[PDB]
Every structure is written in C-alpha cells, then in structure tokens.
Amino acid sequence: EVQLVESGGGLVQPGGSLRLSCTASGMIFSFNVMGWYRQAPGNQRELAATITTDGSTNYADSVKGRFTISRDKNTVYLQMNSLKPEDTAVYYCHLKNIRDYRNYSNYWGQGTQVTVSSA
Amino acid sequence: YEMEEDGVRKCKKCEGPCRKVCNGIGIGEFKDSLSINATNIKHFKNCTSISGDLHILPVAFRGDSFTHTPPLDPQELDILKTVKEITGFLLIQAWPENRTDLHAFENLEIIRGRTKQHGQFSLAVVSLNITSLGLRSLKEISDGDVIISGNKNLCYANTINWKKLFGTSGQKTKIISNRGENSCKATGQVCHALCSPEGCWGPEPRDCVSCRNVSRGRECVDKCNLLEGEPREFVENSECIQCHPECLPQAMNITCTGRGPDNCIQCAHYIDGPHCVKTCPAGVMGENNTLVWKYADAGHVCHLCHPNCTYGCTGPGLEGC
Ligand SMILES: *[C@@H]1O[C@H](CO)[C@@H](O[C@@H]2O[C@H](CO)[C@@H](O)[C@H](O)[C@H]2NC(C)=O)[C@H](O)[C@H]1NC(C)=O
Ligand SMILES: *[C@@H]1O[C@H](CO)[C@@H](O)[C@H](O)[C@H]1NC(C)=O
C-alpha cells in the first residue's frame, strides 16, 4: 500500500534546532494527513505535528510555538526550534489515508531518534 | 505552577493531598509518647510520609491514667489513611477487635526500615484478631525483617512472596503461629481466582499482589472488553483503559489502539484531520487569528472552506457562501 522514508534526526544541545523530513510513496489517496508522532522514555506515543492536504495543521500543546509542520505534495518537513530535554524521543513519520469517515488506514515509519543533551 | 520547597516539589497540582512529612512516635511532637494515642492522633492528620517509627501498643486502646490519655476511638484510626511512606518501622501489637483487617494502612506503599524494632524488624504485626493483613498498596519493605506472629485467626499471610517486596540481602521473614494453613483453605479463605501466584492481602479481587490477567481500575478482572462490552477499551501496561467516546464501537474486532480520538479504527460522526470529532470546526482560532470553518462532505469528512467564506459554508468553492 504505502511506504514512508524518513530523513533527519540526531542529537542537539538544549535550545538548538533540527529539521525532520518524510516523503511517502505508494497508493496515496486524495484526502490524507501526514506528520509525526513521538514517544519519549517511557511514555505513550503521542501526536507531535500533522498537516493535511488541505493545509490545516495539528500540534501537541507541548510543541506549539516551537514546531512548524509544512507540506509539499506528499513530503512533509518539521522545523523543530527551541528544543528542550522533554523533547528527546523517537519520532515516527505517519500517513492516514482517508477515504471516508468510516474508512482510513495508518502507516508508520521506522522511527528517528532525537535526543537533546549538554553532550 | 510547580516548584520545590524544603526537599519537596509541591503545589496545588496535587492529586489528592499535598505531600506532608510528619514525625514518628518518640520524636518531636510525639516525644515521651509510648504509642499512637487519643491525644496525639490529631497530629497525624493529612500526613503522607512519616520520618521515623510508628507504634500501636495496647496502651493506646485501654487508655492510661498516669498520663491522663483517654482510650483511642477505633473509628479515629482512619486518620492514617493518607500515610503512604514510613521511613522507620511499623509495629502493631493492638488493633480493635471490631476491625477485621488493617485497612487504615490500605494506602501505605513503602516501609524504608532505616530504623528497626530492637535491631531487626521493620514490619511487626503480633497478637491481633484480624483475619487478613489488608496492606493492599504495600510494594516495598526496603531494609528490615518482617515478623507476623500470634494472630490466631489470620490467613493469607503465607501466600505473599516476601522476597518480591524486599530490597536488601539478608532480609528474612518470620510468619509463625497464625491460623493454620490447612484450616485457611478449608474455610475458603484463600487467594481469589483472579490473583497470580504472588499472593494476596485478602479475599477480594482488589487484594491481589498482582493480577493473572488484567486490571480495570484498582480492581482485578479476567478480560478487558476488547471485542465486546459497554465501555470497551484497550490494554496498556496490563490495564484496561477506556476508548475515546468518539470512536464507533466496532463489532468482532478491536475498537481502538490508544486513548486519543485519532488512533481508533473508525469514527462515529465526522473527521478533522487525524482526529475523530462530533462537529466540524465552526469558529476555532489560532494565531494570526482567522476563524476557520469546515464543511462535512457526503462521506462525513470535514474539509476547510475557501478562506474568504468566513460566515460559514455548506458547499465547496465559492458556492457555499
Ligand atoms: C499520649 O500522647 C501525649 C501527647 O503526645 C503524651 O503526653 C506527653 O507525656 C509526656 C510524659 O508523660 C509529657 O512530658 C508531655 O508534656 C506530654 N505531652 C502532652 C501534649 O500532653 C503521652 O505521653 C502519650 N501517652 C502514651 C501512653 O503514649
Ligand atoms: C486536611 O486536608 C483537607 C483536604 O480536603 C483540608 O480541607 C483540611 O483543612 C486539612 N486539615 C489540616 C491541614 O489540618
């Protein structure tokens, strides 16, 4: 169906910045949302930022103001600014192929490790 | 906001009571007191931690004339329900015969045993008419030895695996002269079917050390409502956790995979991006503020509208407004 290949990630120092990018090839539908989820040690996976083909974006309240999600065709980019220790996590690209309100499917990437640390 | 004062990170963020460390028996306010009694039990109100030891001697329940202390009301032992930590030991040599268990310490979580009775004991329960310990929340006995002895009709205490609560090597246990092991199984006073082979503190399902299957609340059940049920749910860390109200109950198969309204399988009304909603946004704001309206197509998926149609819309393009 749909595959997703991720680029970016890495470690930074507090307050620094990183860019994440994910491009999706497959049976992609006209209305669909693409973005990132994340899971820190040892919490649950939670949404970080998802933009839709329509342009409308969704952010976690923890990241609003500091994270910027943007979309060109079927590739999305995330500008992560003013990064804090709590942001250290594994980041999963994502795609929700939406046909109908009762018909959709979810695809996930392998996961990119982001750590921030004074090291 | 939340910050740290005197070694504790406290504010009114707290769920329940704010953490409050109190002194043990024999130190400070409780100087020269041999035991928790009727005049000093007041000073344990709203305590969650106890720096030092705790004695409950018989002197407490018969009163004392030399020190003019009345006897202790059994009902006023509920003052101890907020306590969750004891740095010293816990010694009980007296408890109301009206009361069948130690449910005043049901929320006790850890006995550090930095100071030990005589030289060895951190938990000591001797000579009570209780039928079950009832220390449901007790997860760690960090240093001292355990003595539970002389409780002529106490059961369950042998089911517990005491090494799974300990913290140091050399830590023994002396369970001796309580009710008989055979007599307990014969009267039906044995761990509930839903407990695991780790033990229990009493008969009921909420008294298990751990569960054999899963837990809903602090109770301990068999199955979680994954495929059938009224408020059906999913399993997270061996715990039944409700499923967002806006995800259609799907029959025969799982109905969600997480708590949020996004990671379920089918929505019950409409869809806005990743999330399943009951109403498409009609007047939500953000920054560089403009009210974004959204219309639901025939397949109940909400799409936003042409930006200039700010007084609502029903159709796409320019035609709705
Ligand atoms: C009951 O508690 C009271 C209060 O903590 C204890 O009273 C103290 O007793 C000592 C010695 O008798 C006196 O020096 C203190 O002045 C008393 N304090 C108060 C506030 O009365 C009493 O010792 C306790 N009794 C028992 C049997 O534990
Ligand atoms: C104990 O805690 C309760 C919390 O409901 C509070 O209302 C009460 O005033 C407290 N009593 C004290 C601190 O003596």
Domain CATH code at residue A73:
2.60.40.10
Same domain flag for B176 and B314? no
Residue B218 placed within a domain: no
Residue B289: give its domain's CATH number: 2.10.220.10
- Say yes or no: B32 and B173 in one domain: yes
Report the distance separating Cα B21 and Cα B41, nearest Å: 15
| Last residue of one domain, picked from the residues B189, B223, B253 | B189
Pick the residue from chain A with its C-alpha nearest to B306. A54
Which of B36, B40, B43, B76 to probe ligand 1 with, by most ligand atoms within 8 A of CB?
B40
Distance CA B67, CA B262 (A): 65
Chain A residues 14-33 within an 8 A CB cutoff of chain B: 31, 33
Resolution (A): 2.9
Structural domain tally of chain A?
A: 1
Which residue out of B271, B272, B292 would a mutagenesis test of the A interface target, given it has the greatest number of A Cβ atoms within 10 Å? B271
Tokens linked to B45: 């109100």
Contacts of residue A70, defined as CB under 8 A and 6 or more positions apart, other chains included, come to A51, A76, A77, A78, A79
Q: How far is the C-alpha of B294 from the C-alpha of B283, rounded, in Å?
A: 9
Q: Which of B139, B155, B189 is the last residue of a domain?
A: B189
Query: Among B146, B164, B189, which residue terminates a domain?
Result: B189
CA distance A38 to chain B (A): 13
Query: Which range marks the domain in which residue B182 is found?
Result: 3-189
Strands B49-51 and B85-86: parallel
B37 touches ligand 1 (CB under 6 Å): yes
* Interface test with chain B among A34, A63, A86, A102, by most B beta carbons within 10 Å: A102
**If you ran DSSP here, which 8-state letter would residue B25 be given?**
T
Report, in angstroms and rounded to the nearest whole number, the Rg of chain B calculated over CA atoms: 28
Q: Distance between CA B107 and CA B78 in Å, rounded?
A: 11
How many angstroms separate the CA of residue B299 from the nearest CA in chain A?
Answer: 5
* Residue B31 covered by a domain: yes
Nearest to B35 by CA among B2, B57, B8, B61: B57
Residues B104-139: b if buried by 16+ CB within 10 A, e if exposed: bbbbbbbbbbbbbbeebbbbbbbebebbbbbbbebe
d(CA A83, CA A92): 17
Beta-carbon separation of B258 and A50 below 8 A = no
- How far apart are alpha carbons A55 and A33 in whole angstroms? 9
Residue A45 structural domain: 2-116
H or E element that contains B272: strand B270-272
d(CA A2, CA A95): 8
Listed in sequence order, the residues at least 6 apart from B208 whose beta carbon sits closer than 8 Å to its beta carbon are B191, B192, B194, B195, B196, B198, B199, B200, B201, B220
What whole-number distance in Å separates Cα of residue A96 and Cα of residue A99? 10
* A77 closest CA partner among A36, A31, A32, A27: A36
How close is the Cα of B33 to the center of ligand 1, in Å? 5
Give the closest ligand to the alpha carbon of residue B28.
Answer: 1
Same domain, B176 and B306: no
CB contacts of A47 in chain B (<8 Å) are: 260, 262, 274
Q: Does A101 touch chain B (CB under 8 A)?
A: yes
β-bridge partners, A38 = A46, A91
Do residues B308 and B300 touch, judged by C-beta distance below 8 A? no
Residue B26 Cα to ligand 1 middle (Å): 10
Strands of chain A, DSSP E: 2-8, 10-12, 18-26, 31-39, 46-52, 57-59, 67-72, 75-80, 89-100, 103-108, 112-116
Rounded distance between C-alpha atoms, residue B260 and residue B258, angstroms? 6
B73 falls within a domain: yes
Cβ B232 vs Cβ B265: under 8 Å: no
Cross-strand partners of B240: B235
Question: Helix (H, G, I), strand (E, B), or coil: what is residue B43?
Answer: helix
Find out whether the beta carbon of B30 lies less than 6 Å from any atom of ligand 1: yes
Q: How far does B28 lie from chain A, in Å, by closest CA?
A: 41
How many domains are there within chain B?
2
In the chain, the amino acid numbered B150 is G
For ligand 1, whether the C-beta of B254 sits within 6 Å is no
**Is the domain of B301 the same as that of B181?**
no
* B113 within 8 A of B143, measured Cβ to Cβ: yes
From atom 14 of ligand 2, which residue's Cα is the shortest distance away?
B45
Domain assignment present for residue B60? The answer is yes
A45, A50, A100 member nearest B301 (Cβ): A100
B75 Cα: distance to centroid of ligand 2 (angstroms): 18
Return the CATH number at B173.
3.80.20.20
Subunit contact A31:B303, Cβ cutoff 8 A: yes
